[PDB]
């Protein structure tokens, strides 16, 4: 129920399902962006995953245990978005991040645009470690999207 | 509302991947509710 990997986050009522996001299972903990689940519980097969840690300002939440993803963008190298878009299999997209310059420091940011239900897809370093999650960002003047590389603290 | 998860793959770097996107340098602000906004 908590096997390592990337997962779709789905919702259903009485009819079909909608993909609202994506997340990462690592070390028994499920990691996603807060705006995907609004911090509500998740079903995994016949099991229930309860929220454990989260932070709306970071737009992150973890289930079953504390945040486990510790790898950091090195501030230099190309990265890969492992995008899991609604209705499409996972795909890797390589990019050189730009930068969100904030009063509190710089954050890597990727100029890659996917449907909203791709939120929570992991961004990877060359060793395959998850350096953050995709899906909290800004829309620039021409309507295109730039996502922070959002990482928590382990 | 039934919110549930389903496995979608392994987490692996792809060798010889397609490279796309620019590297924008943007001034942003982050509010207490987690919204990023461009500084105008």
């Amino acid at each position: 129920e908590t096997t390592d990997g990337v997962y779709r986050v789905m919702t259903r009522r009485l009819l079909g399902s909608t993909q609202v996001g994506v997340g990462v299972m690592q070390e028994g903990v499920f990691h996603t962006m807060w705006h995907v689940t609004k911090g509500a519980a998740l079903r995994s097969g016949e099991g229930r995953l309860d929220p454990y840690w989260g932070d709306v300002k970071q737009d992150l939440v973890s289930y079953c245990g504390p945040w486990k993803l510790d790898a950091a963008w090195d501030g230099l190298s190309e990265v890969q978005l492992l995008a899991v878009p609604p209705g499409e299999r996972a795909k890797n997209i390589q990019t050189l991040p730009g930068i969100f310059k904030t009063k509190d420091g710089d954050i890597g940011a990727v100029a890659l645009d996917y449907p909203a239900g791709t939120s929570g897809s992991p961004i990877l370093d060359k060793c395959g470690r998850v350096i953050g999650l995709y899906g909290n960002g800004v829309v620039i003047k021409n309507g295109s999207y730039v996502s922070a590389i959002t990482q928590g603290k382990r | 509302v039934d919110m549930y998860i389903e496995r979608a793959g392994d987490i692996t770097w792809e060798k010889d991947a397609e490279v796309t996107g620019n590297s924008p340098r943007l001034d942003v602000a982050l509010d207490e509710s987690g919204d990023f906004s461009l500084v105008e």
Partner: peptide, 4 residues
Amino acid sequence: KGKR
């Protein structure tokens, strides 16, 4: 974004 189909900002989030």
